[PDB]
Structure formats: structure tokens, C-alpha cells
């Protein structure tokens, strides 16, 4: 009921020691993006890696 399909990750921040990744949910608008802890992504690590590849390349 409360589980949804991830599309891609588009940002990352640390908030009070919490590392959070901004998730774009498949089929939803950017108004529905949420900040998720890395633990919520442990089943879609490849999606997180694609985002980390981009930010490393953009630096660079």
C-alpha cells in the first residue's frame, strides 16, 4: 500500500546527520518528490549509483 516504484535520484543532502536522496517516483510529478534515507534505497542501489555517477562526473 505504502511502497512505490522509484524512477531516479536527483539530489542528495545531509540533514542533522541524516543522508537523504531526492527521489523522483515513476509516474509522478516533481511536486511529489521526497527526500529518502539511503536505507529506503537498499533494494534499488543501481538507481542511487547512477545519480552518484552523475554528480561525480559533474564535479570534474
Amino acid at each position: 500500500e505504502d511502497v512505490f516504484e522509484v524512477e531516479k535520484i536527483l539530489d542528495m543532502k545531509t540533514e542533522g546527520g541524516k543522508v537523504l536522496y531526492k527521489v523522483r517516483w515513476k509516474g509522478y510529478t516533481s511536486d511529489d518528490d521526497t527526500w529518502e534515507p539511503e536505507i529506503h534505497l537498499e533494494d534499488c542501489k543501481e538507481v542511487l549509483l547512477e545519480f552518484r555517477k552523475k554528480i561525480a562526473e559533474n564535479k570534474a
Partner: peptide, 5 residues
Amino acid sequence: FALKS
């Protein structure tokens, strides 16, 4: 598939 906060 992920829990959405």
C-alpha cells in the same frame, strides 16, 4: 520499489 517517506 521503495517505501516513500
